[PDB]
Design a protein around this nucleic acid. Structure first.
Length: 1295
RNA sequence: GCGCAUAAAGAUGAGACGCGUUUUAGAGCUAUGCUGUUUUGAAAAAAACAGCAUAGCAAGUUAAAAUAAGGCUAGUCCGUUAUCAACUUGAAAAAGUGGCACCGAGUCGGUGCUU
């Protein structure tokens, strides 16, 4: 934003410098008046009227030119010598609002009507195809393509106008291309490969040449007709019927807007004064009622204005036209509105050239520098250049050929565009992990494709019908495979390799591949692209040409601009024809591989003398894979990759964390946990612990679900409808290229039937149909298919603030179950569709989490695992392997969760933050006991190191659970049930478990089922748990970004701009509060009394205060200031007063609750079971006993009420609010136990640590109790604090 | 444990476009009434001179300023975000700093050695 404003201002400044000498001849203090335009007449240096200075001429300008567009159109058409100031105003106004540069080239005002160009389009389509010429048949195009709605929705009606032509058809695709959609002509022109075009992209010209040369010189005028059609379709609201009236279509259209505004204004005034004369004072005077005063002088928008006046209009018998204009959205529209984001810069450039050409016959200087001004308007900084810095920006990369201030005329000379784009892309590409200082080859390298092909073919094992044992394909065999099939087709399926090679060359009756499934992963696409472009196989097949090939790929990847690619390849223009040079430069590639060139064919092996590519291409008897090649002491590769870099280089205990990859959201958390761990080892005897157990977010899903969610769209759809038996695919077949639209994917997901209405959806109104969320966006933000459903209209869902009403579930349950058996919707989707009848959505299901926090947790766990793996284990053994004094153990979330669930040790997080420390304790105990219990399976849990321990051989059943997923879950249940007291198996029968369950081979008691659970019970019931919030200084924006007032809270917007006479900012964010003690004057006698208080240091003030503190305090209005009594107090500074009542410094004028109600485990588990938190599924018997236990212990309710009352009267000072709570509980004492439990749970947020926020108990809105006075902190107990809350330093604030 | 195909996601950094905000310029008016009023004077009365109030009206679209205060590094550059516990050194970086056998456990209390 800052750079934007500065560069625009400088462009205006450029035009001013160009006009400097002449403006001085016209008006000496013109620019002075323009720079002081903000100032009032009382403080204006020169005249308040900008242009002429006097009053009358300004009034004359406002008369003859109501808008700027009247002067615009006037200067564009007329060739008369106008005043220089007006010319300057027009040009500067054009520069100040240039327009978008989204459309490359130029749109010379052609027909400027959809009708003519559409007729030309139909003419081209009829002359092109005599197979089926399609006419427009008199469809009004300039209303069917200019309607204010979706482009695809416009395509729907457009293709509906002519029956018999499908939307993917050549006519439908062409009118989709005119609308800015993404059509395709692979089925229209019957091209062998896919080839889609789009007008918006800048590669459209090269793609056009590509597709045209692939199909011939025949169909080409149709796309330029569509181009000018789009040029005429952009100005829908700004349509000026004829292009010959002026050369400024936009300006005359704006004049039309002004006119319609005036007409509808006088109209509305007359009509109101006629029918409702009492309402005129509200529409046209009240600015805070969305009337015309609120629309114009007020802050109301066009939508709010229309919504406000629509019932006022329709409640009058007249107006007629105003209702139509409201629906057509062109009622009293202004000129500077919201819809101008579509305006391209080309029309402003056109009007500029017209004004210049019409005024260059008088003044010589603008006739001399008209191309300079055109360069000013046309200038656009390339994205690959970046900041135009002179070495003073950490974001720049641009290299200066010279050292001048870069201007739009010498831009091409000062800026090395080549080196700037080069440095732009190289700074983003990664390096090889094996070879750190070396870069990486592009993604289209022929050597790299040969690498992945040979690597994927080193395990394609061949089994002959007569062969006795499987043997991998030999070196010559691989080359045979490549040359016969992998070099002929784009991608070869395993079935194709089996049928088209083995039977033709080896003539084997049957093949048996044990290396690749379904189809081959690797391919040789670049080879086929080159052979189709350069049409010379010999160059790509030649081994000597590989350096030229790698450089060509490098050029086509590093650059995109046709001129740049053409310049980089002028040295290679002798090997291919100029037309071939055009086709190659037209083609451009994106992406980069993962490995270097020196790794593939640079690094040779000592024993062999061949490279990695050769070993993958041929290794003889044992065609070893990449991992076997690298991890082989017999070769030299392992030795030479180890010379990489140095991990133990200069990285402090900080820095290294801020040197990590990813988002900064993770770095904070990481720094916190690592410093916590360091303190933990530092406290307990300054020696390393036995074990360290951590929790990882990686859990083991089943094979069926993991393949069902990752089932590619055509796979899941085809299998789904085939299992269902419906013929929706035979009626409308589409591939995944045009399937990326939301509602179409949803349409094919629901088998052409609405999930609510149980009716057939139609391909016409696709964007008109509503996509509805199962759970509303008020609760959670979800865009995934698990929450969305395509419906005809969103009013059939039921309620707008909850999961679909019972009318739809009890009417669509059969359809949802039939969609569940067809494998179309997932189990979670059906559960959400069926959650309505399960209880709907309670207020407990707030669900504030966002998926990014999930992948963020995965990120922080993956990073910490490899940070901790190297920070705790430092020494190495005698065989060069790290000594693991501390083991980092990774416990899955499922085990600890089930451990809390299967032993009545439930957790309700919202009471306090003790459940985290409880989880930590449970992870530690479960981890150490588990690893002591079974050391043969202990290798799977520790971070880093691992034993082979193949799960296939563990449970090699007839079932074949293997393939890990199913096997890992069955193995997980098998090892997890051994810790329990009674073992019930899903495998077959039972066995009672020993209360100790120690392992005979270890001979050590691993767990006591009678006393360790009691220590868990105690820990879960322990009152003292160290919960500490990080006292951090607030940083950031100076204040809230949102008139003049007589208050001191206003902040001067500029230096000399007084907020009392100009208006200013408000609500400054206090960075950190400062405790001061001095003397100020008091009373009429102005006595210096000793005072102490909290001073608010805002973010803007922080630098100025931290520089000279004493001078700042003396400037504030203090006398005799204690220099040694200036305490810097961040937010959340802990303070304690009476009966363990703690308060945290929320601000310089607000505090926070600092105490937690230490409640025993019994009430917690009771609340869990009573409020019905997880539907407590198991065997019905124990569920019914627990239900009985809920009905019996109904006194726990009143006991909780007592607990809250004492804690609130002791700390919270909840008084009147607490009374309202008690009254609500007495009023609702008759309500069922579950609801009262849920609402008791609701009440805990009042006792939560930190800021006080509002909540509800039933219907009783319980607001927040803010602490508006910070006087009591001044004589409290300062608690200067430490990271585990163990080292408490207390300060009695009495000094 | 990588080379890989499909379908997604994130993150980064540039380049630009729509407003908006608040000021000023939109030279808005009419009548009536009020006082001070050079006022014709010795006063009265305004031309209400000055404002005030009452009503009634009328237009109303846009132009300009800046857009974190600002900074200097004067660049067409920087400045809203990571990055801050207490504490002693050390310019900073960085380092160090608070025990433990045992009994209880209300925001913890003791205890052997013993800080």
């Amino acid at each position: 934003a800052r750079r934007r404003y500065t560069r625009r201002k400088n462009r205006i400044c450029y035009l001013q410098e160009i006009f400097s000498n002449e403006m001085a001849k016209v008006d000496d203090s013109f620019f002075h008046r323009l720079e002081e335009s903000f100032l009032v007449e009382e403080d204006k240096k020169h005249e308040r009227h900008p242009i002429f200075g006097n009053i009358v001429d300004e009034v004359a300008y406002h008369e003859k030119y109501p808008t700027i567009y009247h002067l615009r159109k006037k200067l564009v058409d007329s060739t008369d010598k106008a005043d220089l100031r007006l010319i300057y105003l027009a040009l500067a106004h054009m520069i100040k609002f240039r327009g978008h540069f989204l459309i490359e080239g130029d749109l010379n005002p052609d027909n400027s009507d959809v009708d003519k160009l559409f007729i030309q389009l139909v003419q081209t389509y009829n002359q092109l195809f005599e197979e089926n010429p399609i006419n427009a048949s008199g469809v009004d195009a300039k209303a069917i393509l200019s309607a204010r709605l979706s482009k695809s929705r416009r395509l729907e009606n457009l293709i509906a106008q002519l029956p018999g032509e499908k939307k993917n058809g050549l006519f439908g695709n062409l009118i989709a291309l005119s609308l800015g959609l993404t059509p395709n002509f692979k089925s229209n022109f019957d091209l062998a490969e896919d080839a889609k075009l789009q007008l918006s992209k800048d590669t459209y010209d090269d793609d056009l040449d590509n597709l045209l040369a692939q199909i011939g010189d025949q169909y080409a005028d149709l796309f330029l007709a569509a181009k000018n059609l789009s040029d005429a379709i952009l100005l829908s609201d700004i349509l000026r019927v004829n292009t010959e009236i002026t050369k400024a279509p936009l300006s005359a259209s704006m004049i039309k807007r002004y006119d319609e505004h005036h007409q509808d204004l006088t109209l509305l005034k007359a009509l109101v004064r006629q029918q409702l004369p009492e309402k005129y004072k509200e529409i046209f005077f009240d600015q805070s009622k969305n009337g015309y005063a609120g629309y114009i002088d007020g802050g109301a928008s066009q939508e709010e204005f229309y919504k406000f006046i629509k019932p006022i209009l329709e409640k009058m018998d007249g107006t007629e036209e105003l209702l139509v204009k409201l629906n057509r959205e062109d009622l009293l529209r202004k000129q500077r509105t919201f819809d101008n984001g579509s305006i391209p810069h080309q029309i402003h450039l056109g009007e500029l050239h017209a004004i210049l050409r019409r005024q260059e016959d008088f003044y010589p200087f603008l006739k001399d520098n008209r191309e300079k001004i055109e360069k000013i308007l046309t200038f656009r900084i390339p994205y690959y250049v970046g900041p135009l810095a002179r070495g003073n920006s950490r974001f720049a990369w641009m290299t200066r050929k010279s050292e001048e201030t870069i201007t739009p005329w010498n831009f091409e000379e000062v800026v090395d565009k080549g080196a700037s784009a080069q440095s732009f892309i190289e700074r983003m590409t990664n390096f090889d992990k094996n070879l750190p200082n070396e870069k990486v080859l592009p993604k289209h390298s022929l050597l790299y494709e040969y690498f992945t092909v040979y690597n994927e073919l080193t395990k394609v094992k061949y089994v002959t019908e007569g062969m006795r044992k499987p043997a991998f394909l030999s070196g010559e065999q691989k080359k045979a495979i490549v040359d016969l099939l992998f070099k002929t087709n784009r991608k070869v399926t395993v079935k194709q390799l089996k049928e088209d090679y083995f039977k033709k060359i080896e003539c084997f009756d049957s093949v048996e591949i044990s290396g690749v499934e379904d189809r081959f992963n690797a391919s040789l696409g670049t080879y086929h692209d080159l052979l189709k472009i350069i049409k010379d196989k010999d160059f790509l097949d030649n081994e000597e040409n590989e350096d030229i090939l790698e450089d060509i790929v490098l050029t086509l990847t590093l650059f995109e601009d046709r001129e740049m690619i053409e310049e980089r390849l002028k040295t290679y223009a002798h090997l291919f024809d100029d037309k071939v040079m055009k086709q190659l430069k037209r083609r451009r590639y994106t992406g980069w591989g993962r490995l270097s060139r020196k790794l593939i064919n640079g690094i040779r092996d000592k024993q062999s003398g061949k490279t990695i590519l050769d070993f993958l291409k041929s290794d003889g008897f044992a065609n070893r894979n990449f991992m076997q090649l690298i991890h082989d002491d017999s070769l030299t590769f392992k030795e030479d990759i180890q010379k990489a870099q140095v991990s133990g280089q200069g990285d402090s205990l900080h820095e290294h964390i801020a040197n990590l990859a990813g988002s900064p959201a993770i770095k904070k958390g990481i720094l916190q946990t690592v410093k916590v761990v360091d303190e933990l080892v530092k406290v307990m005897g300054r020696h390393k612990p036995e074990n360290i157990v951590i929790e990882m977010a990686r859990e083991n899903q089943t094979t069926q679900k993991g393949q069902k969610n990752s089932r590619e769209r055509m796979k899941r759809i085809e299998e789904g409808i085939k299992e269902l038996g419906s013929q929706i695919l035979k009626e409308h077949p589409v591939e995944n290229t045009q399937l990326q639209n939301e509602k179409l994917y949803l349409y094919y997901l629901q088998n052409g039937r609405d999930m609510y209405v149980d009716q057939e959806l139609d391909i016409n109104r696709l964007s008109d149909y509503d996509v509805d969320h199962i759970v509303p966006q008020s609760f959670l933000k979800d865009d995934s298919i698990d929450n969305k459903v395509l419906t005809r209209s969103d009013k059939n869902r039921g309620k707008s603030d909850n999961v679909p009403s019972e009318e739809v579930v009890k009417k669509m349950k059969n359809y949802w179950r039939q969609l569940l058996n067809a494998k179309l919707i997932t189990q979670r989707k059906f559960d959400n569709l069926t959650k309505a009848e399960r209880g709907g959505l309670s207020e407990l299901d707030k669900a504030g989490f966002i998926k990014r926090q999930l992948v963020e947790t995965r990120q922080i766990t993956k990073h910490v695992a490899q940070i901790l793996d190297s920070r705790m284990n430092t020494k190495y053994d005698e065989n060069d392997k790290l000594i693991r004094e501390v083991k980092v153990i990774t416990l899955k979330s499922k085990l600890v969760s089930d451990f809390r669930k299967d032993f009545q040790f439930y957790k309700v997080r919202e009471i306090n933050n003790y459940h985290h420390a409880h989880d930590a304790y449970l992870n530690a105990v479960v981890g150490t006991a588990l690893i002591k219990k079974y050391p043969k399976l202990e290798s799977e849990f520790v971070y880093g190191d691992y034993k082979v321990y193949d799960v296939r051989k563990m449970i090699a059943k007839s079932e074949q659970e293997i393939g890990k997923a199913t096997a890992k879950y069955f193995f997980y249940s098998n090892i997890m049930n051994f810790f329990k007291t009674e073992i019930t198996l899903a495998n077959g029968e039972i066995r009672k478990r020993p209360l100790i369950e120690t392992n005979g081979e270890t001979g050590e008691i691993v767990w006591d089922k009678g006393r360790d659970f009691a220590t868990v019970r105690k820990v879960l019931s322990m009152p003292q748990v160290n919960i500490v919030k990080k006292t951090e200084v607030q940083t950031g924006g100076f204040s809230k970004e949102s008139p003049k007032r007589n208050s001191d809270k206003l902040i001067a917007r500029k230096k000399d701009w007084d907020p009392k006479k100009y208006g200013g900012f408000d609500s400054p964010t206090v960075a950190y509060s400062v405790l001061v003690v001095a003397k100020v004057e008091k009373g009429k006698s102005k006595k210096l009394k000793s005072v102490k208080e909290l001073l608010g240091i805002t973010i803007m003030e922080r630098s100025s205060f931290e520089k000279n503190p004493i001078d700042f305090l003396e400037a504030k209005g203090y006398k005799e200031v204690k220099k040694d009594l200036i305490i810097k107090l961040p937010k959340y500074s802990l303070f304690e007063l009476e009966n363990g009542r703690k308060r945290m410094l929320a601000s310089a004028g607000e505090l926070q609750k600092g105490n937690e109600l230490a409640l025993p485990s019994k009430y917690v588990n009771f609340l869990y079971l009573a409020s019905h938190y997880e539907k407590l599924k198991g065997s019905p018997e124990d569920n019914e006993q627990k239900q009985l236990f809920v009905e019996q212990h109904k006194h726990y309710l009143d006991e909780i009420i007592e607990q809250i009352s004492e804690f609130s009267k002791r700390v919270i000072l909840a008084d009147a609010n607490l009374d309202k709570v008690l009254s609500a509980y007495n009023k609702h004492r008759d309500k069922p136990i579950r609801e009262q439990a849920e609402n008791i749970i609701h009440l805990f947020t009042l006792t939560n640590l930190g800021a006080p926020a509002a909540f509800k108990y039933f219907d009783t809105t319980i607001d927040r109790k803010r602490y508006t006075s910070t006087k009591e902190v001044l004589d409290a107990t300062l608690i200067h604090q430490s990271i585990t809350g163990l080292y408490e330093t207390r300060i009695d604030l009495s000094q």
